[PDB]
Amino acid sequence: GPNICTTRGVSSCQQCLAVSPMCAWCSDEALPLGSPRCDLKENLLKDNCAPESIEFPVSEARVLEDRPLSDKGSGDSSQVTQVSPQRIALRLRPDDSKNFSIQVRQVEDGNVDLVFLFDGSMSLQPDEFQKILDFMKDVMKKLSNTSYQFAAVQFSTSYKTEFDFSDYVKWKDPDALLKHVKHMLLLTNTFGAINYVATEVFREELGARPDATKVLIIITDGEATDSGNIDAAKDIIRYIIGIGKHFQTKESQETLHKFASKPASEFVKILDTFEKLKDLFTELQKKIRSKVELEVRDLPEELSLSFNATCLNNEVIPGLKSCMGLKIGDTVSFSIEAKVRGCPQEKEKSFTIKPVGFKDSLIVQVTFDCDCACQAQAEPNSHRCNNGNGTFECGVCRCGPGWLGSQCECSEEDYRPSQQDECSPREGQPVCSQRGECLCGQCVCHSSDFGKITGKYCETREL
Ligand X SMILES: *[C@@H]1O[C@H](CO)[C@@H](O)[C@H](O)[C@H]1NC(C)=O
Restricting to residues 95-124, which ones interact with Ca ion according to CB under 5 A? 121, 123
Nearer to Ca ion, 32 or 126 (CB): 126
Asked whether position 221 contacts Ca ion by CB under 5 A, the answer is yes
189 binds, among ligand X, Ca ion, none (CB under 5 to 8 A by kind): none
- Contact of 226 with 189, CB cutoff 8 Å: yes
306 binds, among ligand X, Ca ion, none (CB under 5 to 8 A by kind): ligand X
Amino acid identity, position 397:
C
Name the minimum Å distance from CB 232 to Ca ion. 23
Name the minimum Å distance from CB 401 to ligand X. 5
Judged on CB neighbours under 10 Å (0-12, 13-18, 19+), 84 is buried
Nearer to ligand X, 145 or 227 (CB): 145
188 binds, among Ca ion, ligand X, none (CB under 5 to 8 A by kind): Ca ion
318 binds, among Ca ion, ligand X, none (CB under 5 to 8 A by kind): ligand X
Name the minimum Å distance from CB 416 to ligand X. 22
Asked whether position 361 contacts Ca ion by CB under 5 A, the answer is no
308 binds, among Ca ion, ligand X, none (CB under 5 to 8 A by kind): ligand X
Each as own residue / partner, the long-range contacts of residues 12-15 (CB below 8 Å, 24 or more positions apart, any chain) are: 12/393, 12/394, 12/396, 12/398, 13/37, 13/55, 13/372, 13/374, 13/393, 13/394, 13/396, 14/370, 14/371, 14/372
275 binds, among Ca ion, ligand X, none (CB under 5 to 8 A by kind): none
CA–CA distances in Å: residue 226 to residues 123, 217, 344: 16, 19, 46
* 254: CB partners within 8 A, 6+ apart: none
Report the helix count and the strand count for the chain, using DSSP H and E: 8, 22
Asked whether position 222 contacts Ca ion by CB under 5 A, the answer is yes
Name the minimum Å distance from CB 381 to ligand X. 7
Nearer to Ca ion, 62 or 245 (CB): 245
Name the minimum Å distance from CB 274 to Ca ion. 13
Nearer to ligand X, 388 or 425 (CB): 388
Q: How far apart are CA 354 and CA 340, in angstroms?
A: 21
What angle do the packed helices 126-141 and 277-284 form, to 10 degrees? 30
Is residue 439 classed as helix, strand or coil in its secondary structure?
strand
- Residues at the site binding ligand X, with contacts judged by CB under 6 A: 99, 145, 306, 308, 318, 335-337, 386-389, 400-402
Instruction: Tell me the β-bridge partners of 39.
Output: 24
28 binds, among Ca ion, ligand X, none (CB under 5 to 8 A by kind): none
Which helix H or strand E contains 64, and what residues bound it?
A: strand 60-65
Asked whether position 156 contacts Ca ion by CB under 5 A, the answer is no
- Contact of 219 with 119, CB cutoff 8 Å: yes
Site for Ca ion, rule CB under 5 A: 121, 123, 188, 221-222
